[PDB]
């Protein structure tokens, strides 16, 4: 696709190039245009390769004396827009607008230009590939430019300040998607000045097409200076004391007032890095600490014991399993059979069994309840993993009343899923808050890499070593007796935790030494390797990113806990303004001291 767009650049520059008309227009040759234009007759509503005019030509090119030439000899063709895809719908006042061009903007506003023209085309679409996004009215373009000039003399001739684009984006949701933020500020507070002034539906109040205000917009993509300028205007001053001052916040859209509607549940959801900046704010990082002091943290700990408590419930009755004897003397066919199966549905006979048996069913009024409570749809994995353990549960119970091969398979996974997730509860205890996001973050980036070298590098030393000893016998040294197994003790002595095959009585073959000091070398490398290719992570811009992602962590897990927990608990934050002067909303009291 992106070839096509350059296909057609080259192509235009060829129309341009071959009209005469057109390449009038691009050199301002005026001298051209008068010849072209009067003496021998040309057509001069020439469409273009990207149907365009010889005034849009003009106005690409800042040639306003070109673009004067035309339109006092077709003024038609200013109110004609690009009819090409990639431009559907743009003028020249666009044109003219976009590069400053306030002498061409204010002639071609004489001649009665739409402002309220849109383009359509392909190139303004808020797309990655598009290298800017300034919306589809003149006046969002010259509202993204920074011209102020052209801003309010767009507006004096008529423009709407309310004209969604597309995407259902205000001039001011726009602006927010800028890159220059200290700029954009002075320029955000132009337009609000020709706003219509009331109380109710203001400009600020417009929605997104994604149902976003513009204060809410900021907040999503990070834009601190934005948001920063809108806090001024719903921040109250109670008094000044010397160095202390009072201000009162109107946390309106801040808090989690509605379902969707708070900003708090955008920043914990939404991907941008940014955005876990914002909860650093002053008027968001003291509310969100308040709920994890109280009614947010202390209730994270009784649902961390509870947990732990039904975990140890579920390990008893693992370590209790139903017991039998082997019942059958198929231990001496293939004589390395050392199982004694335990496996009996007795009816009850219960000394103790009914003691297991109501673990049994905690366990599975547990798990039923955990799967009733996930499943009804940072904390990714130790979410995903209740329901896998919740899931196994289901299945070992299943296994039961059909007592299976595998009876111990799929509660073997319930037991390491079922502790390995108590220490999600591990973010919102201090020490090991960050370092559970450490461990986790790591998992991609650091595991995946020299695992798949340290498979590929066993799968030549292993099918080595079976080589070398399926010749010889599995009695005495027997590390490779089969391929699994030269597979997987290859991969133990990869991480030095087995022994290392040694038989000093008997004579190994002359290719095992060889091999394995290699192996004993090349394992150590890539085990180094991993280490201090690990210790990248170090750069004190990391010391944020360990310790400000782990209070993104509690801030989200303390959204988590407020929306499914009854309102009995957990009261509103801040101070409702009804009866006080401020009527009926939530109001925070802040007080700073400055130096
Ligand atoms: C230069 C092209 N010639 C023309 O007459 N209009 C085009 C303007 C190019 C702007 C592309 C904006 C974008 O990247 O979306
Ligand atoms: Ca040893």
């Given at each position: 696709?992106?070839?096509?767009?350059?296909?057609?650049?080259?192509?235009?520059?060829?129309?341009?190039?071959?009209?005469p008309l057109?390449?009038?227009?691009?050199?301002?040759?005026?001298?051209?245009?008068?010849?072209?234009?009067?003496?021998?007759?040309?057509?001069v509503?020439?469409?273009?390769?990207?149907?365009?005019?010889?005034?849009?030509?003009?106005?690409?090119?800042?040639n306003?004396?070109?673009?004067?030439?035309?339109?006092?000899?077709?003024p038609?063709?200013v109110?004609?827009?690009?009819?090409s895809?990639?431009?559907?719908?743009?003028?020249?006042?666009?044109?003219?607008?976009?590069?400053?061009?306030?002498?061409?903007?204010?002639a071609?506003?004489?001649?009665?230009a739409?402002?309220?023209?849109?383009?359509?085309?392909?190139?303004?679409?808020?797309?990655?590939?598009?290298?800017?996004?300034?919306?589809?009215?003149?006046?969002?373009?010259?509202?993204?430019?920074?011209?102020?000039?052209?801003?309010?003399?767009?507006?004096?001739?008529?423009?709407?300040?309310?004209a969604?684009?597309?995407?259902?984006?205000?001039?001011?949701?726009?602006?927010?998607?800028?890159?220059?933020?200290?700029?954009?500020?002075?320029?955000?507070?132009?337009?609000?000045?020709?706003?219509?002034?009331?109380?109710?539906k203001?400009?600020?109040?417009?929605?997104?097409?994604?149902?976003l205000?513009?204060?809410?917009?900021?907040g999503?993509?990070?834009?601190?200076?934005?948001?920063?300028?809108?806090?001024?205007?719903?921040?109250?001053?109670?008094?000044?004391?010397?160095?202390?001052?009072?201000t009162?916040?109107?946390?309106?859209?801040?808090?989690?007032?509605?379902?969707?509607?708070?900003?708090?549940?955008?920043?914990?959801?939404?991907?941008?890095?940014?955005?876990?900046?914002?909860?650093?704010?002053?008027?968001?990082?003291?509310?969100?600490?308040?709920?994890?002091?109280?009614?947010?943290?202390?209730?994270?700990?009784?649902?961390?014991?509870?947990?732990?408590?039904?975990?140890?419930?579920?390990?008893?009755?693992?370590?209790?399993?139903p017991?039998?004897?082997?019942?059958?003397?198929?231990?001496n066919?293939?004589?390395?059979?050392?199982?004694?199966?335990?496996?009996?549905?007795?009816?009850?006979?219960?000394p103790?069994?009914?003691?297991?048996?109501?673990?049994?069913?905690?366990?599975?009024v547990?798990?039923?309840?955990?799967?009733?409570?996930?499943?009804?749809?940072?904390?990714?994995?130790?979410?995903?993993?209740?329901?896998?353990?919740?899931?196994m549960?289901?299945?070992?119970?299943?296994?039961?009343?059909?007592?299976?091969?595998?009876?111990?398979?799929?509660?073997?996974?319930?037991?390491?899923?079922?502790?390995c997730?108590?220490?999600?509860?591990?973010?919102?205890?201090?020490?090991?808050?960050?370092?559970t996001?450490?461990?986790?973050?790591?998992?991609?980036?650091?595991?995946?890499?020299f695992?798949?070298?340290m498979?590929?590098?066993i799968?030549?030393?292993?099918?080595?070593?079976?080589?070398?000893?399926?010749?010889?016998?599995?009695?005495?040294?027997?590390?490779?007796?089969?391929?699994?197994?030269?597979?997987?003790?290859?991969f133990?002595?990869?991480?030095?935790?087995?022994?290392?095959?040694?038989?000093?009585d008997?004579?190994?073959?002359?290719?095992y030494?060889?091999?394995?000091?290699?192996?004993?070398?090349?394992?150590?490398?890539?085990?180094?390797?991993?280490?201090?290719?690990?210790?990248?992570?170090?750069?004190?811009?990391?010391?944020?990113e360990?310790?400000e992602?782990?209070?993104?962590?509690?801030?989200?897990?303390?959204?988590?806990?407020?929306?499914?927990?009854?309102?009995?608990?957990?009261?509103?934050?801040?101070?409702?303004?009804?009866?006080?002067g401020?009527?009926?909303?939530?109001?925070?009291?802040?007080?700073?001291?400055?130096?």
């Amino acid at each position: 696709w992106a070839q096509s767009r350059d296909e057609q650049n080259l192509l235009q520059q060829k129309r341009i190039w071959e009209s005469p008309l057109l390449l009038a227009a691009k050199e301002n040759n005026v001298q051209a245009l008068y010849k072209l234009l009067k003496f021998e007759g040309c057509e001069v509503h020439q469409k273009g390769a990207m149907g365009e005019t010889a005034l849009h030509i003009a106005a690409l090119y800042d040639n306003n004396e070109a673009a004067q030439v035309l339109m006092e000899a077709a003024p038609e063709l200013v109110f004609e827009p690009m009819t090409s895809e990639l431009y559907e719908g743009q003028t020249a006042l666009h044109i003219a607008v976009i590069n400053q061009n306030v002498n061409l903007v204010r002639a071609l506003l004489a001649r009665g230009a739409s402002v309220s023209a849109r383009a359509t085309g392909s190139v303004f679409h808020y797309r990655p590939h598009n290298l800017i996004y300034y919306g589809e009215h003149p006046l969002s373009f010259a509202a993204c430019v920074g011209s102020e000039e052209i801003v309010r003399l767009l507006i004096e001739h008529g423009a709407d300040i309310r004209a969604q684009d597309s995407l259902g984006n205000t001039v001011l949701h726009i602006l927010i998607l800028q890159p220059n933020k200290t700029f954009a500020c002075q320029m955000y507070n132009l337009l609000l000045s020709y706003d219509g002034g009331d109380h109710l539906k203001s400009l600020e109040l417009v929605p997104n097409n994604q149902g976003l205000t513009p204060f809410k917009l900021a907040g999503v993509e990070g834009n601190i200076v934005m948001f920063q300028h809108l806090m001024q205007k719903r921040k109250h001053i109670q008094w000044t004391y010397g160095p202390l001052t009072s201000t009162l916040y109107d946390l309106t859209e801040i808090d989690s007032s509605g379902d969707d509607q708070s900003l708090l549940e955008l920043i914990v959801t939404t991907k941008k890095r940014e955005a876990r900046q914002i909860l650093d704010q002053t008027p968001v990082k003291e509310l969100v600490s308040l709920k994890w002091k109280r009614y947010g943290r202390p209730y994270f700990c009784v649902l961390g014991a509870i947990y732990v408590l039904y975990i140890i419930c579920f390990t008893m009755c693992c370590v209790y399993r139903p017991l039998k004897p082997r019942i059958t003397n198929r231990t001496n066919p293939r004589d390395n059979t050392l199982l004694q199966q335990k496996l009996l549905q007795e009816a009850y006979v219960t000394p103790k069994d009914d003691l297991r048996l109501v673990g049994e069913l905690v366990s599975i009024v547990g798990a039923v309840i955990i799967l009733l409570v996930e499943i009804p749809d940072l904390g990714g994995p130790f979410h995903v993993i209740i329901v896998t353990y919740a899931f196994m549960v289901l299945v070992t119970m299943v296994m039961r009343l059909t007592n299976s091969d595998g009876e111990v398979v799929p509660m073997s996974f319930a037991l390491v899923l079922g502790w390995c997730n108590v220490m999600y509860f591990a973010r919102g205890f201090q020490m090991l808050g960050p370092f559970t996001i450490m461990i986790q973050k790591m998992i991609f980036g650091d595991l995946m890499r020299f695992c798949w070298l340290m498979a590929v590098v066993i799968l030549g030393f292993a099918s080595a070593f079976y080589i070398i000893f399926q010749t010889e016998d599995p009695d005495e040294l027997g590390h490779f007796y089969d391929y699994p197994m030269a597979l997987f003790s290859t991969f133990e002595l990869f991480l030095t935790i087995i022994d290392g095959p040694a038989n000093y009585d008997v004579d190994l073959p002359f290719m095992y030494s060889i091999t394995y000091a290699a192996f004993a070398i090349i394992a150590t490398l890539l085990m180094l390797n991993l280490l201090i290719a690990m210790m990248g992570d170090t750069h004190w811009r990391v010391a944020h990113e360990r310790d400000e992602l782990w209070r993104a962590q509690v801030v989200a897990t303390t959204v988590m806990l407020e929306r499914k927990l009854p309102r009995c608990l957990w009261p509103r934050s801040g101070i409702c303004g009804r009866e006080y002067g401020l009527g009926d909303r939530w109001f925070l009291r802040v007080e700073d001291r400055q130096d």
